[PDB]
Design a protein around this ligand. Structure first.
Ligand SMILES: Nc1ncnc2c1ncn2[C@@H]1O[C@H](COP(=O)(O)OP(=O)(O)O)[C@@H](O)[C@H]1O
Ligand SMILES: Nc1ncnc2c1ncn2[C@@H]1O[C@H](COP(=O)(O)OP(=O)(O)O)[C@@H](O)[C@H]1O
Ligand code: CLF
Ligand code: SF4
Ligand SMILES: [Mg+2]
Ligand SMILES: [Mg+2]
Lengths: 467, 445, 274, 313, 269
């Protein structure tokens, strides 16, 4: 089980067995369960998760350098607000701005002053504290300050332990924020059960679950991202917890089921006809809505399938390739087969053999392999583009699928266009398939830019190794 | 107070982009797993949507210090990384940048990089921890490390004589000033116009590490920044004996550019006919694009904003404050320099704002916290007209609330896509005028 | 009950901690001794001297750590566990202790062993917050500093009092008293008694310098083990009795530099004519 | 007619009266390496000044003496008096200047190099410069050296733009519509199709071209690239073109409009982006920006994708 | 300047022996600087008379000369300092102090004949091994006594130093003996040094003249220059002054030292 008694979250590698290196056939990564270029840390994922909670202020206990990530996540936060029909504003992340003397004598007074400043300036309903590499090397003991100031102000003060070097993969930064929210914000033993509300563990993508579950007579509680401290608080009252990506939804949903009694759905992720059907059968079986689902399954099968016949014709024998993420990547590898696109290789940045829910019927890789066939050049690598070049020349695809930065520009210099899917709801469900077909068509038209770049560019790698 | 909302700069290890900005140079980082990605994705990709380039972005090797590299040290990881990088990557020069972990733990970096240098490998190591400062301090550290460990000793009878008409240009920070590529292109174009051989040392115009090996042969050093690059210049003066010219104000516009070029020429001793002929042609091109703008800006019915508030690093902060005062005649409102200069240069920086015009005297406050910046903008009544905010993506909401317009001119410029845009010199001044007044006019659109 | 032992370097922290741990074990208590030293010698006299891999030596050679695999059963049944760390001059041992303590807290081994006493034998140079972890508001409440009649030992004890005072006014541990080590002459007892009286603290016990300890050390054994009936083992048994029932912990009240200097100067004039 | 007819009457009048007749032994021998450029309508193409600057720069770079005849780069009546001394007349426009070119051919005998597509980018500009060099028989060494230098500069800024272009989080527009004169219409379609690879959705030429050239322009749009075949319609009424824009299907992605101020409201109706490329450009101040050539393509990309990402701005 | 470092077990006599050596060297006319790498700020206690002086870190641009205080015999006493125990990072503090001293060129703008780095007992991070890097110190001696844990600490420190000795750093000059009174002490401290292939610089006995001088805040050279311990320390300072033979450490393994100790347990039975 998840250990919530501690103010420190274990790492994802320690809790699951994260594998951040591998090359082979996806069937083998499924049966199994010197040079580096830089990765992501857990502090960045904490910035993007706990920094997008509305009504709360995240404190970065670090040197000012670790606070650089406010720019990208501020832009994502603003665009998510604009997408989700909310007023647009900048997120406020505050840094303790530690210096060399604070490395020598400790920086706990600066942390306390920064928390008090957050409370004074914004008066939030919650305050998160983000730890970094240097403040974990010196052991600053942030929990005492957190407890004292929480007792003083009244609002919860949540210490998040999200050092970069603690874990080899950055997915632990989701664990940290979810751990803190579970331990402090989510109210325990509530006296109100909102039987029409379901917790959708999602990101800053267009609202597609709202209309989709509205046909099932459900209200949507988007959490963590663009969520309110009260929405996070009323997460023990919802009738179910769901999400789109398994990787971002294991810890919080499993801990909710174990502790707060929120039912958790063990259903395939909603990508493709089979996956989305099986996903709706169970999100509507938990909420006892197994009568408005078949009437929505049939309606969408009678609406998207006629348009998918002509869409598979426009993409015949086209090669694809997914190079990003862990679980929002097996979903692409499975939707692309729904369009008939050839996918003989992929690159996922990590692979969790088990999930926090520990349920065998939640393997995304097994779903991708058993249904929709196998991938013969499956490869795991923690966002390293000296290895992406080898994979690209090994499979030689017409287009790739990316969501995270760092891999698309290399393929562009090789003349291989990429589909950027920052809006994670674009490829969700039946309209998701219909949108991904159009996206592939548009990208294949964009191939002229990457072919022009590939003919007038020099890769930094050396021909001794390029071979 | 210590706190900093909405950071205005990045880590000292983010000076890896100073090395990556040199052509055919690939920095190597000894740090935590996400220091390189964070610094790139925030100073380049969401600061004008600039790319990694040749040896930047996801090309930068990194040790990605795990828990093993902290408890037991990671000098052998850096040694192994350099050994593998010498065979994986093709770089003229490798720069080693240590994070806050090797600096706190006390890894003996010299004992690892030194053996490579003794073999003739072009590699360099710099100590840039997170606690040491921001990316400006790291920039100075990287420049000094490259100089000392790659340029090495100088012998005129072996390495070549000294050309009095060759200048090293120490100017705005690469990749942090959003328009640095075009700005360096403009600076080099003007310097080559007045008759100099330019070692721009950064960006596409640079010649790579061959230009850096020629640093001692340069006649002097130009520091085109209010405070950045003065440590490098002093180190070079001590080491090789090169005189330095400190031009604190970066010349946006024909008025400042003429004076800048005249002072550089009076330094070197260039021909006063080539300088006044290049300047004559540049003025001729520049002025004729102004009459038509005049017509617009001297006869606009709906009125133009009169007060501005520049919030940015000292270089652009002071170039923009000088331009928006001596050319556009705008009212200088709130000026805040947010790059955290050293305390010793603050007085002279401010004294530049005192003499910002014969008729106008202003002042700047050094503030790295954006909450206090926002509160001083709120606490400065900007007349009856709306004020124009010259800042970053953090001022969008405040400018919308103050009924005014915002022009993004520095880090982070999250709503500009920049390829070759420049705001310095003649062409850059024209582009800046277009951007400013397109933004102001686009208020009823 | 969770205990932490501090003091000057090379003063007997490991030795006296091992002795009192063995005395507690012989009385029938479940005692675990956690070594916070990179040299991995804190529990050397509980195992016979033979090397035992630590937790930091299970982290460098594995990816998922089971804290139990690093727990070793020593003399008398003591759960002797070493934090370990790098060789001198490399790495970061303080972060190593942070990681070790965090690991055994997350594994909840402090509560799955049905322990009675958890004693943290710390090093003598508490140089970072990694080595103050066992006095950090929820891990231990009884802190004792080993000191001797030597003025530098008393200087280190006063410095450690100043250090612990920060954690005491944070909900952390309170100073429980002073352990007196290597005290043979009456001057040795008198000077340390006056120091303790000047700092509003107490002396739990006085242990003399003996050759029993030396010999039992060479062998890799404890004084309670090598000499179960000597005149030095009995003093360790009584100091273990006196540390078991200790409850009167206080916020440390150290002397500033001038006061400790003046005190030492005053006690220098008493050694001349003693 | 319109301002285009007035332009081709004014230029013909100056050529017929002010320039007069030509005597090769009196006014100077014809220079085979001097070119006359008749490309853009001044003050109607909003960005004509930077465009002519870039065109003159390119033509001078490959080794020609350029009579740009419009804008600050010109010398006025000195370049117009050198019209008979030029080696050939370059019509860098789909149909604007062809009548003037024929008038010059009849009056003097200058061969006309017709270049319907104005170059934007590196491929189009390289092809344009090689075709001009082949026409005038210039030294291919200077031509190739200049092309190499310009492409070395260009493909660097494109090596930097490629990260955003292939990696932007929220995606980028796939289809476009161009509304304006035929010159810019065609240049922008060729660029957006060959450099960027955008899908042409609706091209409407609003300058009322004569029927004697519409088939030629339609042919130029029938092959806008080796593999994409599009087309173009001629509608001078704003209401009709707005209805045709509303009647056009683009897809799930909101398109990008290369129209003008009259398409601002229509652009907001489709939730898309509007890059004012034609007339009237009432919501942007223009001094020296250019959208064609080697340096102008980069500025065009800057404007397009600054407008694209500035939806949450 | 002949630059020396002193290591060994904590609380074993590194600071006492170092101050006595510095005093005996300054008694001979040389210029000696003693640098304290312990954050307790007590290495030069017996040279300043026990009075508190500010440390380097209490100045963290800086002018490292304001942290230089000279005491008995004109010895330049420099203390790195640091936080109170249990907070911050003292290793980074020693790194910062040494970096500031080097950047200020203190060791060369002073004309010192000797520099003796007195380090703390628990070398835990690479910031405490700064003295034994390349170009910093060349002679390193580890104080140890007849106590088995003193020998253990010395052997572990040889293991730690071997990394720097093999990487162009300092070489193990030898061993300093302290608290050596009986013949068994001498025998058991000679066997270890013969097993590790190094040399005992000298032997120092445990005398109450050092206790008296300590309480008084002085060193035996100043306190009782006419006593036996002062002459022993003068001989030790002279030996350190002319020492040249430094070798790469050859430390014993865990089993080797375990059997060595078992072989010496029976010598007392
Ligand atoms: N009371 C004593 N009797 C005999 N020997 C002692 C006594 N106190 C300490 N020692 C010896 O002094 C040395 C200090 O070792 P140790 O107890 O491990 O110190 P610390 O734990 O403070 O680092 C050891 O040889 C130890 O056995
Ligand atoms: N030879 C000696 N004779 C008597 N007392 C000594 C002798 N050597 C050291 N001491 C005392 O033992 C204690 C050890 O302290 P110190 O020299 O500071 O150790 P370290 O600096 O190595 O931790 C001090 O009280 C010191 O005066
Ligand atoms: S001040 Fe330090 S060197 Fe500077 S950027 Fe920060 S760690 Fe790095 Fe951080 S972002 Fe994450 S938590 Fe460490 S790995 Fe890195
Ligand atoms: S002083 Fe402590 S925290 Fe700092 S490097 Fe050394 S062991 Fe690590
Ligand atoms: Mg010990
Ligand atoms: Mg000492």
């Amino acid at each position: 089980p998840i250990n919530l008694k501690t103010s420190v979250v274990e790492s994802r590698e320690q809790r699951l067995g994260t594998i951040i290196a591998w090359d082979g056939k996806a069937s083998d990564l499924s049966k199994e369960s010197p040079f580096s270029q830089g990765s992501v840390c857990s502090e960045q994922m904490v910035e993007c998760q706990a920094g997008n909670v509305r009504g709360a202020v995240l404190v970065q206990h670090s040197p000012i350098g670790c606070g650089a990530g406010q720019v990208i996540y501020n832009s994502i936060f603003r665009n998510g607000l604009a997408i989700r029909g909310l007023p647009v504003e900048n997120l406020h992340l505050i840094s303790t701005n530690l210096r060399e003397r604070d490395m020598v004598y400790g920086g706990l007074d600066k942390l306390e002053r920064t928390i008090r400043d957050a409370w004074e300036r914004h008066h939030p309903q919650a305050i998160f504290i983000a730890t970094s590499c240097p403040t974990a090397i010196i052991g600053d003991d942030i929990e005492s300050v957190a407890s004292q100031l929480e007792a003083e102000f009244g609002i919860p003060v949540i210490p998040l332990h999200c050092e970069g070097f603690k874990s080899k993969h950055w997915s632990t930064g989701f664990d940290a924020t979810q751990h803190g929210i579970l331990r402090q914000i989510v109210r325990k033993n509530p006296e109100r059960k909102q039987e029409d509300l379901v917790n959708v563990i999602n990101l800053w993508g267009s609202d597609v679950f709202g209309p989709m579950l509205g046909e099932l007579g459900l209200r949507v509680n988007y959490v963590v991202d663009l969520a309110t401290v009260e929405d996070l608080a009323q997460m023990s009252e919802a009738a179910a917890t769901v999400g789109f990506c398994y990787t971002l939804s294991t810890y919080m949903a499993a801990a909710l089921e174990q502790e707060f009694g929120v039912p958790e759905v063990k259903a395939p992720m909603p990508y493709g006809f089979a996956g989305t059907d099986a996903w709706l059968r169970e999100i509507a079986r938990v909420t006892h809505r197994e009568e408005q689902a078949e009437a929505y399954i049939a309606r969408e099968h009678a609406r998207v399938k006629p348009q998918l016949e002509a869409l598979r014709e426009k993409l015949k024998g086209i090669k694809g390739f997914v190079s990003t993420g862990s679980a929002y990547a097996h979903g692409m590898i499975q939707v692309l087969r729904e369009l008939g696109v050839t996918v003989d290789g992929s690159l996922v940045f990590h692979h969790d053999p088990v999930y926090d829910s520990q349920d065998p019927r939640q393997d995304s890789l097994a779903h991708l392999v058993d249904n929709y066939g196998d991938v013969g050049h499956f490869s795991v690598g923690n966002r390293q583009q000296f290895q992406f070049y080898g994979l690209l020349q090994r499979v030689k695809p017409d287009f790739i699928i990316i969501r995270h930065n760092g891999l698309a520009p290399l393929a562009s210099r090789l003349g291989i266009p990429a589909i950027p899917l920052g809006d994670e709801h674009i490829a969700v469900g039946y309209q998701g398939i219909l949108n991904l077909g159009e996206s592939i068509l548009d990208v294949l038209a964009h191939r002229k830019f990457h072919e022009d770049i590939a003919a007038h560019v020099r890769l930094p790698y050396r021909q001794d190794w390029l071979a | 107070t210590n706190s900093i909302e909405q950071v205005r700069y990045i880590c000292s290890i983010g000076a890896m982009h100073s090395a990556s900005a040199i052509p055919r140079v690939i920095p190597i980082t000894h740090c935590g797993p996400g220091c390189a990605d964070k610094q790139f994705m925030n100073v380049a990709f969401y600061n004008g949507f600039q790319g990694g380039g040749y040896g930047g972005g996801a090309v930068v090797p990194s040790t990605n210090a795990t828990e093993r590299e902290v408890v037991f040290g990671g000098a052998e990881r850096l040694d192994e990384l350099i050994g593998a990088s010498l065979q994986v990557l093709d770089a003229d020069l490798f720069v080693v940048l240590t994070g806050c972990i090797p600096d706190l733990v006390g890894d003996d970096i010299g004992s690892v990089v030194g053996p490579y240098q003794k073999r003739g490998v072009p590699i360099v190591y710099a100590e840039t921890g997170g606690f040491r400062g921001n990316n400006f301090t790291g920039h100075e550290l990287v420049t000094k490390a490259i100089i000392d460990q790659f340029v090495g000793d100088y012998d005129a009878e072996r390495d070549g004589a000294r050309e009095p008409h060759t200048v090293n240009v120490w100017s705005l920070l690469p990749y942090h000033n959003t328009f640095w590529r075009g700005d360096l292109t403009e600076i080099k174009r003007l310097l080559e116009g007045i008759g100099l051989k330019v070692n721009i040392l950064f960006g596409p115009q640079s010649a790579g590490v061959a230009e850096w090996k020629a640093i001692p042969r340069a006649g002097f050093n130009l520091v085109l920044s209010p405070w950045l690059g003065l440590d490098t210049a002093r180190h070079l003066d001590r080491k090789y004996g090169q005189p330095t010219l400190h031009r604190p104000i970066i010349p946006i516009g024909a008025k400042e550019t003429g004076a800048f070029l005249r002072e550089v020429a009076a330094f070197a001793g260039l021909d006063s006919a080539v300088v006044e002929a290049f300047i004559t042609a540049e003025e001729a091109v520049y002025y004729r694009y102004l009459e038509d703008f005049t017509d617009f800006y001297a006869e606009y019915w709906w009125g133009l904003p009169a007060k501005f508030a520049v919030i940015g690093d000292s270089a652009y902060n002071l170039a923009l404050t000088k331009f928006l005062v001596n050319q556009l005649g705008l009212i200088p409102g709130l000026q805040i320099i947010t790059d955290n200069p050293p305390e010793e240069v603050r007085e002279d920086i401010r004294a530049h704002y005192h003499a910002i015009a014969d008729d106008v005297a202003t002042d700047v406050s050094f503030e790295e916290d954006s909450y206090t910046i926002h509160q001083k903008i709120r606490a400065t009544d900007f007349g009856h007209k709306a004020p124009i905010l010259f800042g970053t993506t953090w001022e969008r909401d405040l400018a919308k609330e103050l009924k005014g317009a915002i022009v993004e001119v520095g880090f982070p410029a999250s709503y500009e896509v920049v390829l070759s845009r420049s705001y310095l010199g003649y062409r850059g001044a024209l582009t800046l005028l277009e951007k400013i007044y397109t933004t102001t006019v686009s208020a009823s659109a | 009950k969770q205990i932490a032992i501090y003091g000057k370097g090379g003063i007997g922290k490991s030795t006296t901690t091992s002795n009192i741990s063995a005395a507690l074990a012989e009385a029938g208590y479940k005692v675990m001794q956690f070594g916070c030293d990179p040299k991995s010698d804190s529990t050397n006299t509980l195992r016979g001297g033979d090397y035992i891999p630590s937790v930091l030596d299970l982290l460098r050679e594995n990816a998922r750590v089971d804290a139990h695999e690093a727990i070793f059963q020593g003399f008398g049944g003591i759960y002797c566990v070493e934090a370990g760390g790098p060789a001198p001059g490399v790495g970061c041992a303080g972060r190593g202790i942070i990681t070790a303590v965090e690991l055994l807290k997350q594994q909840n081994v402090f509560e799955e062993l049905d322990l009675d006493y958890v004693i943290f034998d710390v090093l003598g140079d508490v140089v970072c917050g990694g080595f103050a972890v066992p006095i950090r508001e929820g891990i231990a409440e009884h802190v004792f500093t080993v000191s001797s009649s030597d003025f530098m030992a008393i200087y280190a004890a006063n410095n450690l009092f100043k250090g612990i005072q920060k954690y005491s006014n944070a909900g952390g541990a309170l100073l429980g008293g002073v352990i007196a080590n290597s005290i043979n002459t009456d001057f040795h007892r008198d000077i340390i008694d006056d120091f303790v009286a000047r700092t509003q603290t107490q002396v739990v016990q006085y242990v003399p310098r003996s050759l029993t300890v030396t010999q039992a050390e060479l062998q890799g054994r404890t004084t309670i083990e090598a000499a179960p009936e000597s005149a030095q083992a009995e003093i360790y048994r009584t100091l273990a009795r006196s540390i078991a029932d200790h409850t009167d912990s206080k916020v440390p009240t150290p002397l500033n530099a001038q006061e400790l200097r003046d005190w030492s100067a005053s006690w220098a004039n008493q050694l001349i004519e003693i």
